Design a protein around this ligand. Structure first.
Ligand SMILES: CC(C)CC(=O)C(=O)O
Ligand SMILES: CC(C)CC(=O)C(=O)O
Ligand SMILES: [Cl-]
Ligand SMILES: [Cl-]
Ligand SMILES: [Zn+2]
Ligand SMILES: [Zn+2]
Lengths: 335, 335
């Protein structure tokens, strides 16, 4: 009788945490192996072929997939064939938040004492794995920021679209595929990301429309030529890296963005605003804010600071839109 | 208009994951610092004193507490005084699951490929931090298994209580404080845990009632004398470590437990059963099962295997109770 009461009380106390904890660990483990990229609710993963492609022993891969099937994350369709559960993309999205705070930002969790005593020594010793930062933020973005930026670029029907920090040019290839007769300039300093975006642009069929330029966003303050005539300039979570050290460079990048825009054009920036108080956003906002401010020393600006800076760059009007990503804001700065 | 739809859709997609991700990272970070032990909803943490006790710079501790206050996990009562939010213990409990899968079992997430190719080399290279295993399971236990075992021992009104794997003797001190005129034998091989339990037993006032014995549970198969006359013998998640290597030793420990019990006595074992299919437990059950079976090679037994083994040890009747901890079962084996 007492065991039944403790059972109902404990289920209410645990809530959704055991499911989320299990999903995040299985998905991070599978992503590091390269397995999660082959999991999709509309098609099967064939173990014989995937084990060869990923260079894993097939028995070990089958035991991983059988544990993930027992968890309810995949369905065994036939022998050696597994399909993701129908709500897989939502589970992967939620796992993104746990991976970001517990995996991508792990050096900060484990070595906080070092950061509090000698920040400069700690900042160069305990560094984040950039592949984990990239995958976890892509998972968070899938349902919480990427579709708002995507629908905003597309519905403006642009002739030219520029992406500052384009990465693998996924947003640029999707906007070009939906807007008939549009060109795009993908800007990213990484040679590894640019070479991957170059091959992805060719297979999509837009090698003449999409120009990949291996350059830093800070180089746009000196050379804004590639921005000229753009209808939409996109910048997703790339400006706070410059603040507060490269403040004047960042201000020049924004001023160049405004002058370069074609009539009716806009600069669409998505960024994180610091320490919100509202109940829905406050907890994740505080984690994003503390990791940026305390551990990375990157300046996050409020909506008011952002609007003032964007008006100081010549922009006539600035609109702020709340994103589902807690503490995330989309600023549309009209020329 | 499109931003409003993406906003509602994204909030529904993210659900409770941003809050849980943020709470787990703040609580793991604060626990490693030694701060979380001073956070309680009924009293304040005084920063001037806590920074000195933990040997942390006070400004850094204040900035951590101000971020945790912004998150809603603490309330600033006065200057330099912070109190945990009223539902702090529930949030800490839920964080326990995330800490267990993402922190305590991190070597398995990051090095799964090594385990799949050379298990023996991987098992000795990528080892779990035992302090993280202990704290995360204590947090999960607080609302999901500890109270059921506690209420079961107490309501049986025992004269003598034995705890195999007593740790810091917290359960034994709580049962002794509620059952008037009861003695307890705390058994734990760790010298660091035994020395901490020895001082905690003295401050509680039960130094004559509670005997701390620094011994292994496997030594009970050869020397069962300390078990004789016990009304309740408790064993929380300690038997699967022996399986499947020390099978015969484990069987002798259980057979000795049965003979040693005083009339009407019982052995209360809590353990994890493998790969459950029911919707509520399947996901966390699969994570517990895969970490134990694949990475640790520790045998988890089903309810049927456990009942058969307990009857093979002489026990007349065995009852299985579902615990709120998913895949957790409490077996009461009556003499
Ligand atoms: C999506 C962002 C929160 C990613 C970021 O700014 C970071 O991980 O540093
Ligand atoms: C509470 C248990 C799941 C802990 C355990 O068995 C482990 O972490 O290995
Ligand atoms: Cl003008
Ligand atoms: Cl008998
Ligand atoms: Zn950042
Ligand atoms: Zn275990």
């Amino acid at each position: 009788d007492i065991a039944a009461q403790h059972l109902a009380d404990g289920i209410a106390a645990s809530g959704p945490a055991p499911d989320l904890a299990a999903a995040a660990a299985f998905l991070e483990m599978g992503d590091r192996l390269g397995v999660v990229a082959h999991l999709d609710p509309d098609r099967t993963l064939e173990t014989a072929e995937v084990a060869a492609a990923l260079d894993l022993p097939e028995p070990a891969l089958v035991r991983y997939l059988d544990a993930v099937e027992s968890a309810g994350l995949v369905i065994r369709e036939g022998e050696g064939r597994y399909r993701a559960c129908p709500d897989f993309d939502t589970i992967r999205h939620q796992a993104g938040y746990i991976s970001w705070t517990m995996n991508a930002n792990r050096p900060f969790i484990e070595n906080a004492r070092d950061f509090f005593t000698d920040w400069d020594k700690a900042a160069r010793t305990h560094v984040r794995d950039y592949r984990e930062v990239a995958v976890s933020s892509q998972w968070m973005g899938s349902h919480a920021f990427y579709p708002t930026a995507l629908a905003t670029i597309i519905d403006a029907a642009p002739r030219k679209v520029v992406d500052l920090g384009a990465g693998t040019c996924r947003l640029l290839i999707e906007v070009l595929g939906a807007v008939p007769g549009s060109t795009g300039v993908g800007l990213d300093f990484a040679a590894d990301a640019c070479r991957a975006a170059e091959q992805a642009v060719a297979q999509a069929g837009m090698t003449d429309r999409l120009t990949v330029v291996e350059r830093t966003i800070q180089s746009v303050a000196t050379d804004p030529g590639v921005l000229e005539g753009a209808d939409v300039i996109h910048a997703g979570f790339v400006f706070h890296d410059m603040l507060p050290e490269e403040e004047d460079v960042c201000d020049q990048v924004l001023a160049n963005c405004r002058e370069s825009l074609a009539p009716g054009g806009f600069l669409a920036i998505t960024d994180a605003v610091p320490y919100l108080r509202n109940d829905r956003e406050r907890r994740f906002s505080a984690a994003v804010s503390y990791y940026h401010g305390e551990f990375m020393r990157r300046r996050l600006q409020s909506e008011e600071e952002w609007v003032e800076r964007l008006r100081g760059a010549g922009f006539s009007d600035v609109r702020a839109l709340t994103l589902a990503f807690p503490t995330g804001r989309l600023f549309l700065a009209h020329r």
